[PDB]
């Protein structure tokens, strides 16, 4: 008696769209949450020079 397993309704991660870019921004921000030390966090947040 299994239930219906649907895929999550999220935007594509590789598409050329605005929602896809917002999902890629959430992807690198997820690596800051997963970073253990503060040095690793600061490194990811400040390594892109614009």
């Amino acid at each position: 008696t299994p239930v219906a397993r649907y895929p999550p309704i999220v935007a594509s991660m590789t598409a050329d769209s605005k929602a896809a870019r917002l999902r890629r921004i959430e992807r690198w921000q997820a690596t800051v949450h997963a970073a253990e030390s503060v040095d690793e966090k600061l490194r990811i947040l400040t390594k892109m020079q614009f």
């Binding site: 309704i9 999220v10 935007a11 929602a19």
Partner: protein
């Protein structure tokens, strides 16, 4: 290989004006009964098709407003209702799209 000689206009006319090069007359053209415009027998009328597409575009714009965002396809059927119309018993429990227009004669409520 470079051409050995210039081709004369006489020769070139025979080549260019050969029946094989001439545009063929089309016999499948007809008059559309609905609008009176020309169409080919095996192809949808351009005038009538554009009329359907114009209304279809307006309905799709209305669907966009109700959904109000991407990835929001509804899980129920959709019904288009024009001004002066009310939801039918069959057309109950369905997404309702309201068009600020009178129902076109060609578009028949089912």
């Amino acid at each position: 290989a470079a051409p050995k000689n210039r081709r004369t206009i006489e020769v070139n006319r025979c080549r260019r004006r050969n029946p094989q090069k001439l545009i063929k007359v089309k016999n499948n053209i007809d008059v559309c009964p609905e609008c009176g415009h020309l169409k080919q027998k095996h192809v949808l009328c351009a005038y009538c098709y554009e009329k359907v597409c114009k209304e279809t575009a307006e309905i799709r714009r209305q669907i966009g407003k109700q959904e109000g965002g991407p990835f929001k396809a509804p899980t129920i059927e959709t019904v288009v209702l024009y001004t002066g119309e009310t939801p039918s018993e069959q057309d109950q429990g369905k997404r309702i799209i309201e068009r600020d227009r009178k129902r076109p004669s060609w578009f028949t409520q089912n």
